[PDB]
Ligand SMILES: O=C(O)[C@@H](O)[C@H](O)[C@H](O)[C@@H](O)CO
């Protein structure tokens with residue numbers, strides 16, 4: 001049999017974890033045992049960035065990644081989750097099957113990473129902080145954690161905070177030790193990581209409707225048979241639809257779970273938060289093609 005390790009940062013029982021189990025079961029079933037996934041939640045194989053490195057070098061790994069992270073390699077991918085670019089997961093899904101996207105995925109393949117599935121719904125990212133945040137000025141001097149992603153570092157800087165890059169597994173002790181004052185993620189990820197134990201203000205900035213790729217190194221992926229590849233990709237499509245079902249009410253459920261555990265939920269000045277990123281989306285990523293955000297904003301509109 002062909003064993004593949006699946007890596008992500010989410011805790012057991014979270015939507016992404018349930019989706020990966022769905023994917024694993026389906027691949028095992030369709031391949032009659034020839035393809036098996038072994039799941040590694042909670043960053044067990046290492047940090048998200050570290051695992052991408054292991055994959056690129058040929059490890060038998062499929063790992064969640066991030067478009068904002070992948071923009072180190074193919075810059076234009078980073079616009080997919082650019083702040084406030086679209087409120088619609090469905091329109092993003094369409095974008096992620098467009099020729100504009102295909103060409104970027106083909107570019108990434110030549111840099112030794114392959115996107116197997118591009119459009120897993122991860123959820124709507126919100127700030128979780130020690131003190132309430134309702135407008136950008138409230139982030140003044142606040143050390144807000146971001147993952148290793150150029151897109152989110154620049155977004156949090158534009159929003160008014162002090163972006164502090166760190167791996168997901170270091171966030172909880174970072175909050176507890178006072179190294180950082182908050183982070184951002186979807187409710188299901190904030191609840192799963194128990195970050196509510198050390199940061200009790202959920203501020204509904206809703207800055208990213210986050211789409212997730214799962215990727216493998218081209219040097220491992222290309223040495224799979226075409227038949228194995230197709231089983232994995234066919235199954236991944238069903239996994240996306242299944243996860244869409246999981247996430248539909250899971251984000252509200254987690255919102256309620258957060259409140260029950262003592263988190264205060266703050267509405268924010270959304271027009272002020274959207275305004276705060278107007279410069280950064282236009283000229284803050286000099287490596288982007290000219291007018292990329294507005295181009296994609298508009299593509300998303302034909303949908
Ligand atoms: O906060 C984190 O480090 C994770 O929740 C990431 O945002 C997540 O794994 C994404 O990189 C996946 O697309």
Ligand SMILES: [Cl-]
Pocket residue numbers: 047048049050147148166167168
């Ligand atoms: Cl990271």
